[PDB]
Design a protein around this nucleic acid. Structure first.
Ligand SMILES: [Cl-]
Ligand SMILES: [Cl-]
Ligand SMILES: [Cl-]
Ligand SMILES: [Cl-]
Ligand SMILES: [K+]
Ligand SMILES: [Mg+2]
Ligand SMILES: [Mg+2]
Ligand SMILES: [Mg+2]
Ligand SMILES: [Mg+2]
Ligand SMILES: [Mg+2]
Ligand SMILES: [Mg+2]
Ligand SMILES: [Mg+2]
Ligand SMILES: [Mg+2]
Ligand SMILES: [Mg+2]
Ligand SMILES: [Mg+2]
Ligand SMILES: [Mg+2]
Ligand SMILES: [Mg+2]
Ligand SMILES: [Mg+2]
Ligand SMILES: [Mg+2]
Ligand SMILES: [Mg+2]
Ligand SMILES: [Mg+2]
Ligand SMILES: [Mg+2]
Ligand SMILES: [Mg+2]
Ligand code: NA
Ligand code: NA
Ligand code: NA
Ligand code: NA
Ligand code: NA
Ligand code: NA
Ligand code: NA
Ligand code: NA
Ligand code: NA
Ligand code: NA
Ligand code: NA
Lengths: 92, 56, 237, 194
RNA sequence: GCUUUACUGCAGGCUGUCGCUGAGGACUCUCACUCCGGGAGGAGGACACCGAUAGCCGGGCA
RNA sequence: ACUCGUACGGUCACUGAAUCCUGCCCAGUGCAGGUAUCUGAACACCUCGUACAAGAGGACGAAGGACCUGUCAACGGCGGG
RNA sequence: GAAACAUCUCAGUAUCGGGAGGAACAGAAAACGCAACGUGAUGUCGUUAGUAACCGCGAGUGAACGCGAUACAGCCCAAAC
């Protein structure tokens, strides 16, 4: 479906309606220094590594919307519930 | 030839004999080893924890 | 499954061992200080149970009585010589350097003084081709060109008993008698005639290998069977 | 002023540099031709030996032992085993090489008792350690105030029960506080979790 | 019990790297080390073997 | 162990005396050779990060793979229209 | 056992190899860290506590300091000279 790049809506920070910019959430890079990372190294040994021997699941036929709504005046973003959408294109 | 009765006829070979060290008829005269006390194999006396129940 | 036959071999049990106690002599070249003043006389010609080929009993000047890997044409009374200055006649042993190029040779040493390793079976021979101060090129019975130290000793002539292979065994019994004199398990049951538990080719409602016969060099023992690292198979192309 | 001994010590801090390096490269050639346990008249590292209890006296013995480098020489499972217990290559023994060396020496001299030991280097495939053993029956030792303690009956086969310095450290008894909950007073009394 | 391109691992083989290991992206050498030689000595040589580790193959086996 | 052995050897497989013979197929799978280029781990090396370290990235690139070739008395195949 | 099963669990259990004593082992801090102007070798018992910690964060697993007790004990080298 189509969707406006910018539009007026509620900003939970400013606490009043203002022009927001919508952007798709870009994946942040992992550091490899989280607890789970240390547990992987620590607990992996001879033979099967339990949970660490598992491999990535599958895919749902359609994914939900993953967006960032940026307040055009205070510059602070907020998140919303996504909805299933095969494709999502921004208008402008 | 049947593996039972008919095969029992050729059994005239002496193997286990009275042991010099323990007195049991377990000294295998062909191997020169007592299957009961270990004579011929070890200076120490043959013994195992599995010869009795674990908590005993 | 169970260990395959090739694995049972390595354990060196009675069934797979050679009847060593029945063998005559370990055929190695004599050791000479230098000079070559070592000659002997052929006293007898005997059968070698380990090679199905004749061997010669020689009595050396210094009282040494030993069996020697006999080339064709050696007989009782003949005088054989071993050393640098040895005459260039059949049956004598001298380093490759003293041997004239183009002369058939047998019982060639791999490393000088090892007593001989190459070309020792019935009727075979190596061909000394090139000389040098550094290397003596010898063509082995397999057709391979082997670079050797000119100091490697060798015997002039082709190995005796040539043509042994020309006659067919004809019957199982003949093979049997020969096999009894070797370190080999015989007869041979085909893998495909066995049960799956006993061989990679065993099993099935009919007889056929359950996969391609060409096996990788890296295959582990118990699995390395069939055509080992075959560069090709068949006859065509 | 510096003791002469301090110089032997300082040399051994870096066995791959200076004169010591050349010494080791020469010695090991002879060592590799020697047996498993070789009694030697004098310690290669005098300072270390004296520091550990050695004395140029009757009943004090020194022997160099060579032990192979690496992990456990282990046989693969011949029956059912869960993946965790199927390993062979990465398994290492719980007793350090120095301790193995000490036991091999004590076995060679059944009447003697292990006092201590130290390293004298290694090549690519083996390590060498010199073990100081003591004759608990010789009167020159039974009368020594510093060594007579080793003559007591409860010190028999001390190396085999881990009562050696290398034994005690390897048993995790070094620390007296945190980390020694399952080591002191013994690995066995703690359920074998040390 | 058996099979395999089932899941997961484990031997084994191949290969890089570190240690043993030294002198002057291709090269020379000798001193460790290896092999031949009864010995003198010869061949090979910082490679190989061995110890450690990494990638690939791996129903041979669990 | 083979081996007191050395290619006229001995190991690993298939077929199964003699006689007349044994066609076509290398695409898939297997084995093997080659390979400009692509891909390809760790150590060491370079950049960033950290007064150090974790970590991120780069450069180089072995066997292997991609790719090319050989091979069926190698696994096997020899149809519809 | 986890109602399958691979890590986990059974369990450092069964069993195996080596060895001491009348008891073993431990033991006079490179400790503790109720953080202190504090405690003062080591075992063990009671408790701390199923607490902290671990764990397909599932099932399960699981201390310590301290405290109250028992009994109390503190020393010898290496080196300097
Ligand atoms: Cl989206
Ligand atoms: Cl034959
Ligand atoms: Cl002892
Ligand atoms: Cl306190
Ligand atoms: K289990
Ligand atoms: Mg693992
Ligand atoms: Mg029966
Ligand atoms: Mg021989
Ligand atoms: Mg034939
Ligand atoms: Mg036979
Ligand atoms: Mg057959
Ligand atoms: Mg059948
Ligand atoms: Mg099978
Ligand atoms: Mg058939
Ligand atoms: Mg067939
Ligand atoms: Mg206790
Ligand atoms: Mg040798
Ligand atoms: Mg299976
Ligand atoms: Mg269950
Ligand atoms: Mg569950
Ligand atoms: Mg537990
Ligand atoms: Mg604590
Ligand atoms: Mg004093
Ligand atoms: Na851990
Ligand atoms: Na088959
Ligand atoms: Na002893
Ligand atoms: Na532990
Ligand atoms: Na069954
Ligand atoms: Na094909
Ligand atoms: Na092909
Ligand atoms: Na269950
Ligand atoms: Na079940
Ligand atoms: Na777990
Ligand atoms: Na208190």
């Amino acid at each position: 479906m189509q969707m406006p790049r910018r539009f007026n809506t509620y900003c939970p920070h400013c606490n009043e309606h203002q022009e927001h910019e919508v952007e798709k959430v870009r994946s942040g890079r992992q550091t490899g220094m989280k607890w789970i990372d240390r547990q992987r190294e620590r607990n992996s040994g001879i033979g099967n590594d339990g949970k660490f021997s598992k491999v990535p699941g599958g895919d749902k036929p359609t994914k939900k919307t993953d967006l960032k709504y940026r307040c055009g005046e205070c510059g602070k973003a907020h998140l919303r519930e996504g909805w299933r959408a095969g494709r999502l294109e921004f208008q402008e | 030839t049947g593996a039972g009765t008919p095969s029992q006829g050729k059994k005239n070979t002496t193997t286990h004999t009275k042991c010099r060290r323990c007195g049991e008829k377990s000294y295998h005269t062909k191997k020169k080893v007592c299957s009961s006390c270990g004579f011929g194999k070890s200076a120490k006396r043959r013994d195992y924890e599995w010869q009795s129940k674990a908590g005993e | 499954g169970r260990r395959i036959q090739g694995q049972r071999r390595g354990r060196g049990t009675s069934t797979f061992r050679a009847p060593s106690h029945r063998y005559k002599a370990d055929l190695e070249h004599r050791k000479v200080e230098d000079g070559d003043v070592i000659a002997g006389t052929v006293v007898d010609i005997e059968h070698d149970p380990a090679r199905s080929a004749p061997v010669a009993a020689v009595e050396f000047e210094d009282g040494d009585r030993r069996l020697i890997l006999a080339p064709e044409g050696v007989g009782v009374g003949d005088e054989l010589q071993v050393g640098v200055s040895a005459e260039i006649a059949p049956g004598n042993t001298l380093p490759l350097a003293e041997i004239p190029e183009g002369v058939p040779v047998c019982n060639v040493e791999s490393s000088p003084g090892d007593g001989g390793k190459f070309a020792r079976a019935s009727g075979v021979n190596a061909q000394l081709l090139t000389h040098d101060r550094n290397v003596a090129v010898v063509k082995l019975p397999s057709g391979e060109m082997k670079r050797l130290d000119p100091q490697c000793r060798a015997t002039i002539g082709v190995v005796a008993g040539g043509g042994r292979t020309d006659k067919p065994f004809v019957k199982a019994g003949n093979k049997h008698h020969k096999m009894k004199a070797r370190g080999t398990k015989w007869p041979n049951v085909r893998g495909v005639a066995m049960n799956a538990v006993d061989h990679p080719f065993g099993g099935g409602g009919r007889q056929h290998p359950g996969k391609p016969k060409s096996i990788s060099r890296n295959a582990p023992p118990g699995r390395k069977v069939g055509d080992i690292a075959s560069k090709r198979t068949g006859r065509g192309g | 002023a510096r003791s002469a001994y301090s110089y032997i010590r300082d040399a051994w801090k870096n066995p791959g540099d200076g004169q010591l390096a050349e010494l080791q490269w020469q010695r090991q050639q002879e060592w590799r031709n020697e047996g498993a346990v070789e009694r030697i008249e004098r310690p290669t590292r005098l300072d270390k030996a004296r520091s550990q209890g050695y004395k140029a006296k009757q009943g004090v013995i020194v022997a160099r032992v060579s032990v192979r480098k690496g992990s456990a020489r282990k046989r693969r499972h011949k029956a059912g085993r869960r993946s965790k217990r199927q390993g062979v290559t990465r398994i290492t023994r719980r007793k350090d090489i120095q301790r193995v060396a000490e036991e091999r020496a004590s076995r060679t001299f059944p009447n003697l008792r292990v006092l201590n030991s130290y390293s004298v280097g290694q090549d690519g495939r083996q390590k060498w350690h010199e073990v100081i053993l003591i004759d608990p029956n010789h009167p020159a030792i039974q009368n020594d105030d510093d060594l007579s303690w080793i003559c007591a009956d409860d010190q028999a086969d001390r190396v085999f029960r881990g009562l050696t310095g290398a034994g005690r450290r390897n048993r995790g008894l070094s620390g007296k506080g945190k980390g020694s909950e399952k080591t002191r007073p013994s690995l066995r009394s703690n359920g074998g979790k040390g």
